[PDB]
Amino acid sequence: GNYCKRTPLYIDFKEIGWDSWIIAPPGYEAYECRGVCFFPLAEHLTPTKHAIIQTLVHLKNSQKASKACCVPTKLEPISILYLDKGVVTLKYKYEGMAVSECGCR
Amino acid sequence: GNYCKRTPLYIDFKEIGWDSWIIAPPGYEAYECRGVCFFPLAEHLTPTKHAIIQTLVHLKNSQKASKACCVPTKLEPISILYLDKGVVTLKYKYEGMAVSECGCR
Ligand code: NA
Ligand code: NA
């Protein structure tokens, strides 16, 4: 089923309104994290102790706390070519842009 | 309204069955993170670039990606007295247990 995992998400810079300064790429594979954090929390989702205990509290009481959340736990940079006061400029490592790993938190 | 923040959450170890191996304390203030991540994402929620972009894509297209999630971004230890493979063990800082900061991710 839809257990927590990384899934595809292509973002075109026109959607976010950044085509005003970004020249290239026109968009990028950003990925996203979707799905449920189900007990027992799988090791590959690197759950914290708090996420484990919150999940267990909620498992037997759905009106107390809530499920752990599927979120990015590791992000990767991309390169962007952009306009810096009208001068074409390249940043090789624009950090925090694409998901490489997901986890329950 | 219900913006992402830290909220109280007391966890009695009995209610999760961890009293089988945790001798003391009987429970602790674990806290939890609750609420929505609304654009513009407030700076105190330390949003990543991915969280900002995902939120913006979702803002004008509710059927693409999703909202960023309110999760713990800093966890604190507690002291516990417990049984480890059948011997009473003391650990002054059992890490990852109590929320001290929340953020949007
Ligand atoms: Na792909
Ligand atoms: Na697109």
Author numbering:
A (entry chain B), B (entry chain A): 320 to 424
Sentences from the paper on this structure:
BMP-9 and BMP-10 are TGF-β family signaling ligands naturally secreted into blood. They act on endothelial cells and are required for proper development and maintenance of the vasculature. BMP-9 and −10 are synthesized as pro-proteins and processed by furin to release growth factors comprised of two cystine-knotted protomers that can covalently homo- or hetero-dimerize via a single cysteine in the dimer interface. Unlike other ligands of the TGF-β family, BMP-9 and −10 are secreted as a mixture of disulfide-linked dimers and monomers, in which the interchain cysteine (Cys-392) remains either paired or unpaired.
